[PDB]
Symmetry: C3
């Protein structure tokens, strides 16, 4: 093929691949956000358990 | 340089950079999957601790 | 427009979009690293709570 057609085809292929990757990145970003939310909730559930365990230790006099 | 050579070089550089980024995205996706698994396990370990703490509170009569 | 100008413009647009995506990927990688650290800490906080709960169960004789 002539070089101009070659180039047009390679550029179009790149445009489609960049679009596909941009959609994947976006999806990974949203997945990360959801995971970050779950980790923040886990941090709070753990802190609550730490306080409940401390209170049980005080009740039974465990140092 | 002539514009056709310029373009061919810029396109090749883009192809290599898009490949490199596609491999990075793929790697980030797999890392996310593994992390999601660890977070699901943490959710279960926390729920189990919540049940064990509740049962201890009942045993000692802690409201 | 002539095809050479067309191509130069499409290539420049691709270069800018690839740069933008590379910066997003990099940012997602660093966010993942920070999240992985928080998950490793959560794993340790959970293990510690499991040991504290086990010790409380032994103290009160709960099987």
């Amino acid at each position: 093929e002539d070089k101009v057609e070659e180039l047009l085809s390679k550029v179009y292929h790149l445009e489609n691949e960049v679009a596909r990757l941009k959609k994947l990145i976006e999806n990974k970003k949203a997945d990360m956000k959801q995971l970050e939310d779950k980790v923040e909730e886990l941090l709070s559930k753990v802190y609550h358990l730490e306080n409940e365990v401390a209170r049980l230790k005080k009740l039974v006099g465990e140092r």
